[PDB]
């Protein structure tokens, strides 16, 4: 079943392309489609209510990791659901594109790894208990 690393790279590659960037510039590294589409819908819902994530973030190379973990820990503090996992991908995507915009491209491959490891260590058990990524595809369509 699904390599989380692969998922992260696919999602981030997509979100970077939406900002005119190529994944290969910064990195030498049905589920994928559902996640891309869900990310687009999530971001539409987000900007209907709030400001684009890329506008809200305050990034520095020295605090990027700490910033990433604080956001993700609060996002999942009182539980996990598929919508929050989509939020997690969208946040990582926003963090990457903003990193590039702010001339901190070094962070792109790091953020992808932070995401992959958080998925593998902290979200994967829940994903398994909820039927795997196939469940997400069937729910989203």
């Amino acid at each position: 079943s699904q390599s989380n690393r692969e998922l992260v790279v696919d999602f981030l590659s997509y979100k970077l392309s939406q900002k005119g960037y190529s994944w290969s510039q910064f990195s030498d590294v049905a589920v994928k489609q559902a996640l891309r589409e869900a990310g687009d819908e999530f971001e539409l819902r987000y900007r209907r209510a709030f400001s684009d994530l890329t506008s809200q973030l305050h990034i520095t190379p020295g605090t990027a990791y700490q910033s990433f973990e604080q956001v993700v820990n609060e996002l999942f503090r009182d539980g996990v659901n598929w919508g929050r996992i989509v939020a997690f991908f969208s946040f990582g995507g926003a963090l990457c594109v903003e990193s590039v915009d702010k001339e901190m491209q070094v962070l792109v491959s790091r953020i992808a790894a932070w995401m992959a490891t958080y998925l593998n260590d902290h979200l994967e058990p829940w994903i398994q208990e909820n039927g795997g990524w196939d469940t997400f595809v069937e729910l989203y369509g």
């Binding site: 819908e41 209510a49 820990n73 996002l75 598929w82 969208s90 729910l139």
Partner: peptide, 21 residues
């Protein structure tokens, strides 16, 4: 703003989740 961002992500996440539940 980390906590603020996470709270907004969570709210839209839960809205998203409820729609496709």
């Amino acid at each position: 703003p980390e906590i603020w961002i996470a709270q907004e992500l969570r709210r839209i996440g839960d809205e998203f989740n409820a729609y496709y539940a």
